[PDB]
């Protein structure tokens, strides 16, 4: 549905709301998605997004180096 | 409290189960988390992990260049 040029507009609109007007805080990302793409977060799974966050080179595997980003999250 | 040596042993135990024995697939990561850190996925939100995936330099702001990762996933 949306084009990449539209998405540039969208990024600029919501990034200007608070703080640095050229960058998106977590609160502005939440408002962007709730307003423009409200079904994006209910289709996503947390496990799938953690895996994408860890797998930086996109080979479908988490190496021991890449696992170090998960180790930072563990409470202890 | 888990030491660093213990976390290395956990990584190696679950990485060896399937396929490449030195790297973790998503199915092995699922088993590792359900067994060793069961509340971790329960406590995470999809939005929080999507933000962390996009915020590559960890300054808590997503720049337009960081945002492009999401643009390529949802737009043509
Ligand atoms: Ca902003
Ligand atoms: Ca990888
Ligand atoms: Ca493996
Ligand atoms: Ca950033």
Reported structure resolution in angstroms: 1.8
CATH of domain A1-76: 1.10.238.10
A45, A47, A69, A73: best mutation site toward chain B, by most B Cβ within 10 Å?
A47
Note whether B46 contacts A45, CB cutoff 8 Å.
Answer: yes
Listed residue (A43, A47, A52, A44) closest to B34, CA to CA: A47
Comparing CB atoms, the residue among B50, B51, B62 nearest residue A23 is B62
What distance in Å separates the CA atoms of residue B11 and residue B38, rounded to the nearest whole number? 15
As beta bridge partners, residue A24 has: B62
Q: Map residue A62 onto helix, strand or coil.
A: strand
**DSSP label of A57:** T
Could you write out the DSSP letters of every residue in B5-54? HHHHHHHHHHHTSSSSTTSB-HHHHHHHHHHH-HHHHHH--HHHHHHHHH
Domains of chain A: which residue ranges? 1-76
Q: Is A73 exposed, middle or buried (0-12, 13-18, 19+ CB in 10 A)?
A: middle
């Amino acid at each position: 549905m949306k084009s990449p040029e539209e998405l540039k507009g969208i990024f600029e609109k919501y990034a200007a709301k608070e703080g640095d007007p050229n960058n998106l805080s977590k609160e502005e990302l939440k408002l962007l998605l709730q307003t423009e793409f409200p079904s994006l977060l209910k289709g996503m799974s947390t496990l799938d997004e953690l895996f994408e966050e860890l797998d930086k080179n996109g080979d479908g595997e988490v190496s021991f180096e890449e696992f170090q980003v998960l180790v930072k999250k563990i409470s202890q």
